[model samples]
Target: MKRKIIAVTACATGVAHTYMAAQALKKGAKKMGNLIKVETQGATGIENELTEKDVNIGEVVIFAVDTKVRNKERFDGKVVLEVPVSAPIKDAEKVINAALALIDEK
Candidate 1:
């Protein structure tokens, strides 16, 4: 089945690792044929920021960050999966599977 995922990416310095995780998440989700949108809280601020529609559409909300995620209140009641920014950079597909596992039993 197809799924839609949304995420926030933030690292300690809000630099490289933040964006790197976002791309890895996107690439991993694509490989599984699922759709994903990542809001990057980076040095440039929130690029690809999620809107109400974007946030509402995702089946899972992933937070792969090493720092506080900006606009975090927006994800108040979602099935949020939290992890270090490096987790995705190292193995995004596994991270994505973890999120899926959270939903599969329901």
Candidate 2:
């Protein structure tokens, strides 16, 4: 089934890991036939920033980050799956699965 997913990725250096995880999440979501928007808090700043509509449309929020998510309050009422910055890069599909599971449990 198709799901609207949103994510944030960040790291200590805010460069490599952040963007890598964001790419992985997008790739994984595509492979799973789901839609995902990833906000990358990297050296270049937040890219593909999630908007109010994006968050409202999302069923779950994945935090594939090693650092605190910027503007975290945007996801106040959404189900969030928090993991290390490397989690999505290591196995993006798995991370996406876990995020879905969060909603399933509710």
Candidate 3:
């Protein structure tokens, strides 16, 4: 079975960039042959909210954000990778793949 990963994308303003980043991460994970769930935390609130079960299902957590994202403490022991939202916007597939590779090594 393939490993599962969950990602959260967010930005300070929470408009186009946040949603775009989320889509990029999702597409990138799919290309890498991994099952991934992407949640967006915009200015309004958590969009596509991730449940505790989702967190439990993942081997790693990717936080692609430009601003401070909430609930960071919850993922204390998990392999949490943080990337600038620009990384995803510019080259999401590469960033996601690199993160997954790093997590695989751990």
Give the alpha-carbon lDDT of every model. Answer: 0.82, 0.82, 0.75
Question: For candidate 3, lDDT tens digit of each residue in 1-106?
Answer: 4568877787876468888888877777777787887878775487787777887887688888777666555555788778887677778877776666767653
For model 3, give the 10-residue run with minimal summed lDDT: 67-76
Comparing 1 and 2 on TM-score, the stronger one: 1
Q: Candidate 2 at 94: error in angstroms?
A: 0.5
Return the clash pairs for model 1, or none.
none
The residue-by-residue lDDT of candidate 2 on 11-74, one tens digit each, is 7675688878888789989989988888887644676778888888887888877777665689
lDDT against true structure, model 2: 0.82
Candidate 3 residue 73 Cα shift, in angstroms, is 3.4
| Per-model TM-score versus the true fold | 0.90, 0.89, 0.84
Task: Tell me the lDDT of model 3 at 104.
Answer: 67
Query: What is the lDDT, from 0 to 100, of the residue 90 in candidate 2?
Result: 88
lDDT by residue (1-106, candidate 1, tens digit) is 6698888898656578887888888888898999888888865477777887889888788888777766677786888888888899898998898888777843
Best by TM-score: 1
Candidate with better TM-score, 1 vs 3: 1
